[PDB]
Design a protein around this ligand. Structure first.
Ligand code: HEM
Length: 393
């Protein structure tokens, strides 16, 4: 009686119909994922928001439970693995360094980088893979700027990061090697900035105080790396998906060309609309019994709260399936909700606005280089997006 989950076809960005159906008739329902525990699946915008924001649903048991998931091999730890108060402490310190202003200050470099990337892509000739040449390039490089990795080092570092993508074609031996390398490198860099502070995120992380309390050498390392993993795959896949949408929907492209100042609010709207995850990601566990739409979730059970479904809930967004770049209000859960809500959001927004702005300015007539139906989609199973987006212009 639990439904096989996930419901989404990875071959595209379609939101499965099961979701809407369950929002009507079974808003708290049972699912069996391909790996880990059978779980509750919550699909209404209201209930998903409730779950993500309730002190009774925790992440700490993730370290010691077989989480419902679409992959076999699980990455654990980081901030997404912690509860208040331990989480609060680390999060307080990080966001003191990692301000909205710091996010904004990187806009110019993000533009330079995107432009250079479009330069290298143009140089290969048409068709050109926008996935490999731009999408998988821009966010890791922006992360390098943010952190304060010297430019001489961006290429080597970018290359180490590629092994952490769910779509990477690599051995466990190949991957440890890259991990040990990025760790060793991040550590040295942290040491250097502590001895000799600059204006980069690493320096500000080293010097962040929250009343007498500070980040340890271990917390600083794990955090720097955590931001790269949190900030890379997601933003890459989201740039890809967004441009896919741009190239397949004439009205979407025409409005952003006519009024580039709509790009920000379009980024919001696409963030709501694109159901980015194969599944729901990041199960919450009940610390005690909880009743929701009249069903009792018992203490210790996992809960999958689908932001992808939430964001297309007809009860919260008028004509939820329509892409309206002018949507007001637009309180989507694209970037999570509650204490774990994406701490990279301000930067992510900057990158997404910049990828669209620059792509549109340089290749206003960029479009698929092959039929939509021939597109090869990623079967990495964490996120949904093209493995290759060949484009012409
Ligand atoms: C388009 C790109 C991105 C998307 C769609 C995205 C989405 C999200 C979402 C939905 C969450 C909350 C998940 C949950 O509560 O289970 C989250 C958390 C997080 N994000 Fe992002 N994010 C993006 C970019 C970034 C970037 C660029 C960074 C780093 C600079 C970043 C750092 C983090 C971190 C550290 C967390 C965990 C925060 C916590 O647990 O307190 N993200 N992200």
């Amino acid at each position: 009686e639990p439904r096989a989950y996930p419901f989404n076809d990875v071959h595209g960005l379609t939101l499965a119909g099961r979701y809407g159906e369950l929002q009507e008739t079974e808003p708290v329902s049972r699912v069996r994922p391909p790996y880990g525990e059978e779980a509750w699946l919550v699909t209404r915008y209201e209930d998903v928001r409730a779950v993500l924001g309730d002190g009774r649903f925790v992440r700490g048991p993730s370290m010691t439970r077989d989480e419902p998931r679409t992959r076999p091999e699980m990455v654990k730890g980081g901030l997404l693995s912690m509860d208040p108060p331990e989480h609060s402490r680390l999060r307080r310190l990080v966001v003191k360094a990692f301000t909205a202003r710091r996010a904004e200050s990187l806009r110019p470099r993000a533009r330079e980088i995107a432009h250079e990337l479009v330069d290298q892509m143009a140089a290969t000739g048409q068709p050109a893979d926008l996935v490999a040449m731009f999408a998988r390039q821009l966010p890791v490089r922006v992360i390098c700027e943010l952190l304060g990795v010297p430019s001489a080092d961006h290429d080597r570092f970018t290359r180490w990061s590629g092994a952490f993508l769910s779509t990477a074609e690599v051995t466990a031996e190949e991957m440890q090697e890259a991990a040990e390398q990025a760790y060793a490198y991040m550590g040295d860099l942290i040491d250097r900035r502590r001895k000799e502070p600059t204006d980069d995120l690493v320096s500000a992380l080293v010097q962040a105080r929250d009343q007498q309390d500070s980040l340890s050498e271990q917390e600083l390392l794990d955090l720097a790396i955590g931001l790269l993993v949190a900030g890379y795959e997601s933003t890459t896949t989201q740039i890809a998906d967004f441009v896919y949408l741009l190239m397949t929907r004439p009205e979407l492209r025409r409005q952003l060309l006519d009024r580039p100042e709509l790009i920000p609010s379009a980024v919001e709207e696409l963030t709501r609309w694109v159901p980015l995850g194969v599944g729901t990601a990041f199960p919450r566990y009940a610390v005690e019994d909880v009743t929701l739409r009249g069903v009792t979730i018992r203490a210790g059970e996992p809960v999958l709260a689908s932001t992808g479904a939430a964001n297309r809930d007809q009860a919260q967004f008028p004509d939820a399936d329509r892409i309206d770049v002018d949507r007001t209000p637009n309180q989507h859960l694209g970037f999570g909700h509650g204490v774990h809500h994406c701490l990279g959001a301000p930067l992510a927004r900057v990158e997404l606005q910049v990828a669209l702005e620059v792509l549109l300015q340089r290749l206003p007539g960029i479009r698929l280089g092959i039929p939509e139906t021939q597109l090869r989609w990623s079967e990495g199973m964490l996120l949904r997006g093209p493995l290759e987006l060949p484009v012409v212009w």
